[model samples]
Target: EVETFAFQAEIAQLMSLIINTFYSNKEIFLRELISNSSDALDKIRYESLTDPSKLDSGKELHINLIPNKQDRTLTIVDTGIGMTKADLINNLGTIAKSGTKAFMEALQAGADISMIGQFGVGFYSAYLVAEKVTVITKHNDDEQYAWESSAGGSFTVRTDTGEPMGRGTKVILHLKEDQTEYLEERRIKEIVKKHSQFIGYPITLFVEK
Candidate 1:
């Protein structure tokens, strides 16, 4: 079954602000995305230390950056602790439930902008370049699910009936026409080098033959 939910007031406002006002600094969207993936990878690794079962045996952790020029899409996939459906709704659907409401205040109060991942709303930065965003994720304890939105007032969540994604998240950005720069392999490499240089896991970009 599919579930559709309206964006919480603060999220609606934040989306509009990010989409309309931050065009010049749009590259930071990649940074925020890599940050989110990096954190998710760290989380699963940390948990496995205490509960060896948290990680699948012999599965190496990594991130994949896939640019599909034919589809005009950029996908960032990470082998990490994926979210449950409840997490999708609470962490994304409601800014009041997420720390984003307070995150804005912290930003205004001079907190480091890099701290966006800690608050969870940094995922919205996908709207900086994507006309629509689709997130397919699976967790150890929950079935795989897909969440999609177009920076509008609402979003959708549904069980994913396709191939299993293992335990991780894949963010597919349907890049807007003017945002095709991100589809360039060189640009993605530059962004990864600049923004995610110190991230612990391997970040691989898939190059088509």
Candidate 2:
């Protein structure tokens, strides 16, 4: 059984720094997450070549952005290798092991700030615009799991009781009022094209009125 652990004091401080000053551009969050998704999809596709049972023939390898203006929700869905509960915590909670330590040391040493992105702790940037976020994911090896967090210290992980997606993950962002700018098609497209056009996967945005 996996025991839950509180954020270490250092980690709490690091999170605060990330929320406050680490990322200069908030829109870059989408780029980072999408890039991570692309990597996951590549991993799964490679695995499937070796294990035919893991192939998700029906699901196209793509990233999709869905915006709901009325509900102020923005969803990012991807056909990528999904995460289980343990994967959720390890990936989301901790930073890249060596990179995180390097980042902290650089900060202490008065190194240039531009190096933060080099560590690629970009997933946490979602907190910049979202009050609450929910991630629904299904892995080939385990049951579907949903992870929810408010960027506070609290987060919850539960079995996904919703529709079964053949593979991959979806992130539902409950956008704060100020973050509504992300819902705009032009802006989102611009951001994606600028930061992620070079990404090796197809990215789609579901625009709404």
Candidate 3:
């Protein structure tokens, strides 16, 4: 069975606040995405321990950075547990859950605001730099799908027509003019080490000179 829930008014306001302010450093955007990828890899690895068949899908649990200078685009791909269509919408579309609401309420009521970062709003951070975003994902249990959005209230999901990247996901960032600094391999590598070095996944850069 599947369940659906809506975000409270305060939570909606909080999502706006986060997408607009919680990020102090722009470079941390890459770090956040890489960290999330690392977590996905970890989740799949843990699952594979029990069901060895899961290991048959993909092996390299790493993140790949591809910068297309010609098109001014940056793509980050990960061979981790990909999300289904519903999973993508529920996980990425809405604001925090009721538990997150209670936690945020307590924080606004004088608890530590730092703790609120533990909630799962990291994916929205892509809006900080991406003028447009496309996610290509293939899950072990479902057909591949593509999710595209411009950080507006809505997103579009359709069948993926391109070649699949095994059993993982890829995020293509159509960077804004001012956010072009991310196209540099050195800059991306620096940010990754600064914030996501401890992440137990390989992070590689595919640069074209």
Candidate 4:
């Protein structure tokens, strides 16, 4: 069954501080997000190296940023290790218990932050630019699921009705009213180059232009 939960207390407090101070200059938001996908790709690549059962083998580790200028949608797609149902709860539920600590750590670690407790907060950073966020993940051991939220107190998760993702994660961000500056191709390319230069995966921007 899909589980739903509220964000941890520290989350509201921390977000209030950042929202007050940094939303205007949060180009850092995309940087953290791309780093997150990079980290996932690295972890699963390590797993595939160690155990064939960890994945089906021979899967590509790529990160794609797709900007929908028409719908004002921005999507971050990663063909990397996906999260399980339980992982969705802890990592995406407003804020997990250790979330506050990790946010600061992520800032200090910069792009070096790896997956989990030390840096799950990066996902939330997308809210600086997005009105709503949806994450669909396919995990090796768990059913495919989609998690949705408006960065409010509570979020929802359920078995996805969409086509199976095989084994990866896709994050869809609905842009804010005037936040389409983030949807610009030139801007996205610059962000990837600045932040994802060392991501160890092929970070691509999916666009016909």
Candidate 5:
């Protein structure tokens, strides 16, 4: 089954603020996303302490970055605690939740990058460098689902038809033409080293030939 929903009323405004405010240093998007994957890895590890089956997906606890220059897509795949349908909607769709106001205030005040994650809007920051974003995720307790959006006004979610991703999330960004700088291995590695060097899990880069 497939369904689509409009982002909350305030999303447009929030997105505009993000792009304009962070325009000068858009590479931060990679940091935000890697941080999110790190958090998901932490969640699965913590949960598996009680429910050993939580790790039965057979996927390792790590993050992989794949940049397909030919396709102009950058994929961040994480073998972590993935999302349920409701989680896809709530976590990625509803920026209008209580923290939105705080998010806006913090951004306007030029709050630091850490506050972006604190407000839960860090994921949407992907729009800073991508024209479209696709999130294909599978949770241990639910079927896999794919969520997609251009951040124009709405987003969509549907059952994923691709290869089984096991228990994790794969986020693919269709990089904007001008943002192709991120398509290079060196560029991505530099950004990761500078920002996400401390992520506990292995952050591997898949170099396409």
Candidate 6:
């Protein structure tokens, strides 16, 4: 079976331009990432109930923001459910994985799969502004690893060998010439509220009784 596996044929066309055109604007990239991160945290939090073993030694689960103005990089780290190397390949690979998409639609439409970490394609929005993007992650089932790409039809995944992240992901963005406007803390603050306004966060929908 390995002999006939069409590795080359299986590879899908590059996604940079198409995705860039989809969301096109860089202003919402951080929002997409944060939503993605939050969903993942929700996923593992659900796992903590049944697969308590998947917990990464009970490391804190939160979204940490690091902005380095000098380096012109913004890093967002999430201590949530990371992925195995095979998961990384499958996710970042060209293979068509529509099950998750359909599952999410159905889950939202009907009563099913309460765990809501299905926003996968949102990662591509990073190309809207960043000249390069880097992801460092460690899963309960895999060693520390990293993935990097310039959204130039190619990306690389390697054994990160760095001190373990313990769990979840770190997304590093190298903003482009005009996209540096997001670097301002106040600007980020404003947009974050806009994009992350209702991403499953608890809301007490009640007026004073």
Best by lDDT: 5
Residue 135 alpha-carbon offset, candidate 1, angstroms: 0.3
1-209 per-residue lDDT for model 2 (tens digits): 22334554555555567667755567877876787788879988888788867765344788899989899988999888888677876765555555667778888888544445567665656777788888899888888888877655656777878998878999888988888999999989999888888888878888696
lDDT by residue (tens digit), candidate 4, 1-209 = 66677767677555555544443566777877777788888888888877867767337788888999888888889978889988887744544547667665666665332232245566667777787889999888788899987765777899998988888899998988978988888998887777667777787788845
* TM agreement with the true structure for every prediction: 0.90, 0.86, 0.82, 0.83, 0.92, 0.73
CA shift of 199, model 1, Å? 0.8
Model 4 segments beyond 4 Å from truth? 1-3, 91-96, 99-120
**Per-residue lDDT over 34-84 for candidate 5, one digit per residue giving the tens place of the 0 to 100 score:** 988999999999999998988989548999999998999999999989999
Better of 1 and 3 by TM-score: 1
How does candidate 4 fare on TM-score? Answer: 0.83
Question: Candidate 1 lDDT, tens digit per residue, 1-209?
Answer: 88998888788877786777634767778888888899888999989989988877326789999999999999999989999998888754554445767777876798644565667778887888899999999989899999999977899999999878889999999999999999888998898888889988899999954
What local lDDT does model 1 show for residue 26?
78
Two-way lDDT contest, 1 vs 4, winner: 1
- Measured with C-alpha atoms, the lDDT of residue 88 in candidate 6 is 65
| lDDT score, candidate 4 | 0.75
TM for candidate 5 is 0.92
Model 3: pairs clashing at backbone N, Cα or C within 3 Å = none
Residue 71, model 1: Cα distance from true site in angstroms: 0.7
lDDT (C-alpha) at residue 14 in model 3: 53
Two-way TM-score contest, 1 vs 4, winner: 1
Tell how far residue 168 is off in model 2, in angstroms: 0.7
Error of 4 at 177 (Å): 1.1
Model 1 residue 130 CA deviation (Å) reads 0.4
The predicted structure with the larger lDDT, 1 or 2, is 1
Total backbone collisions, model 6: 0
Superposition error at 131 for model 2 (Å): 1.5
